């Protein structure tokens, strides 16, 4: 009825934003933070998104409040997202006259001079608006968000807004491939473009600095960190990426300072907690190296405090975002480090049921579970099961290569207890095949086949 009119509207309700129930507390928290701390030109988008999240929570009057706040801030065409959200709001509540009121407002603006004249309207602004909503709703929406901004840059290649959106989506997709071999810095030129056209935007400067750092250009990146830190623009966000920059440079204490300052503004940020975990992890590794694995007295004291601190923050991260895979894995591994194998295991079992956006993250999950099964749980069969499972995920990566090598070591261990084993001989043949060592691959497979026929 009116419902087919609603389905033509370009707004949050029709954009199929991929939002697990599990990610909802976290998303709302990130929406509130952005509203308070992100320096942008139009804050209408994020309140429209706050509205949608309230609506998914079952709090429609709060959702209405957020739409009224967005309206009170409202080019004018971006109001259309607000109005379409209003239309859906009033529908879902059951104010069919009020919904219709707002549909009619959308239609009247859609007659200057829109092609689908009815409720959809095609302009750069609503494209960007779909981009940013997708870009805030988690990694699975990122290819789509990139395409939205890219659509607009196909037409207007010097659009400052969509150049930003495009460059941030790209940097984050680049992020997913840092673990793959033969990753290319696809976001480096877009970020340079984006900084040129949004010269005041510190958020974009710090990601550029991080990309520069990944490509070995530390000096140039550090200038962007120092610049970004000297401007108000998005102080709290600049703090997070500046901290990441200094940690990867090896100024861990400087990182902590920034992260802890940022935690006052945004206590809830799983990014912060995770990254603060990584600072403590890196300090644990420093002490372990300087004391040759045998810390005593005060050193042991400090190592223990840092293991507790990392666990505290990785725990704080996954409580707030249960689907935060990498944070679960780091927690599993901190638990191993602390001697808590059940806690390790428990985090490993939750990891085994996840569908990561980043396929390589499942390789890491199996690799590290397999090592947990070899060295902590003393179960070779499960090590092998899981090293094989990591190997089976096709993607070339350092971690897959690690799994091949871990399988090799374990099977050569087994063959030196018991050389006449059909599985072990076939496994070692397999490993050699995955190394590209084909003479040996065939030699071990042949031995296994000849072992079979001799046994019969």
């Amino acid at each position: 009825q009116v419902k087919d009119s609603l389905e033509q509207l370009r707004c949050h309700f029709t954009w199929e934003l991929s939002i697990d129930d599990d990610e909802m507390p976290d998303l709302e928290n990130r929406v509130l933070d952005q509203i308070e701390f992100l320096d942008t030109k139009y804050s209408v988008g994020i309140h429209n998104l706050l509205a949608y999240v309230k609506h998914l929570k079952g709090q429609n009057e709060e959702a209405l409040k957020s739409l009224k706040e967005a309206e009170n801030l409202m080019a004018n065409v971006r109001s259309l997202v607000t109005w379409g959200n209003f239309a859906w709001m009033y529908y879902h509540m059951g104010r069919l006259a009020e919904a219709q009121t707002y549909l009619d407002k959308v239609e009247n603006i859609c007659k200057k001079l829109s092609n689908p004249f009815r409720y959809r309207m095609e302009c750069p602004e609503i494209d960007c608006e779909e981009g940013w909503a997708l870009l805030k709703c988690g990694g699975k929406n990122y290819e789509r968000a990139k395409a939205c901004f890219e659509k607009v840059l196909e037409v207007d290649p010097e659009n400052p807004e969509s150049s930003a959106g495009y460059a941030i989506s790209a940097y984050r997709l680049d992020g997913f491939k840092l673990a793959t071999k033969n990753h290319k810095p696809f976001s480096l030129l877009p970020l340079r473009q984006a900084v040129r056209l949004n010269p005041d935007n510190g958020y974009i400067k710090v990601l550029l600095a991080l990309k520069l750092q990944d490509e070995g250009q530390e000096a140039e990146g550090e200038k962007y960190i120092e610049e970004a830190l000297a401007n108000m623009s998005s102080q709290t966000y600049v703090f997070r990426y500046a901290a990441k920059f200094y940690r990867r440079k090896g100024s861990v204490d400087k990182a902590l300072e920034l992260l802890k300052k940022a935690l006052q503004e945004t206590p809830t940020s799983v990014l912060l907690h995770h990254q603060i975990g990584l600072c403590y992890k890196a300090q644990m590794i420093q002490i372990k190296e300087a004391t040759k694995g045998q810390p005593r007295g005060q050193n042991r004291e400090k190592l223990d405090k840092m293991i507790r601190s990392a666990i505290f923050h990785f725990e704080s991260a996954v409580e707030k975002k249960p689907t935060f895979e990498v944070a679960h894995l780091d927690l599993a591994r901190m638990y191993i480090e602390a001697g808590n194998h059940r806690k390790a295991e428990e985090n490993f079992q939750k990891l085994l049921c996840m569908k990561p956006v980043v396929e390589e993250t499942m390789q890491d999950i199996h690799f590290h579970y397999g090592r947990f099964q070899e060295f902590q749980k003393k179960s070779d069969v499960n090590a092998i099961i899981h090293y094989l499972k990591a190997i089976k995920i096709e993607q070339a990566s350092l971690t897959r290569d690690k799994s091949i090598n871990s399988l090799k070591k374990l099977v050569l261990r087994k063959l030196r207890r018991k050389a006449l084993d059909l599985e072990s001989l076939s496994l070692l043949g397999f490993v050699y095949k995955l190394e590209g060592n084909m003479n040996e691959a065939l030699e071990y497979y042949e031995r296994a086949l000849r072992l079979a026929a001799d046994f019969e």
């Binding site: 094989l388 599985e423 397999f430 084909m438 691959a441």
Partner: protein
């Protein structure tokens, strides 16, 4: 031993990768009920 012999033929021609595939098919079958899961990886 049909798959062994198919392997040797590829090996003797230089198709090391088809040689591996042939042997895998037979070693898969032998190891289909192996606890590691290697038998299934071979029969894919």
């Amino acid at each position: 031993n049909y798959w062994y012999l198919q392997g040797l033929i590829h090996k003797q021609n230089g198709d090391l990768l088809q040689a591996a595939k042939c042997y895998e098919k037979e070693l898969g079958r032998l190891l289909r009920d192996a606890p590691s899961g290697i038998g299934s990886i071979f029969l894919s």
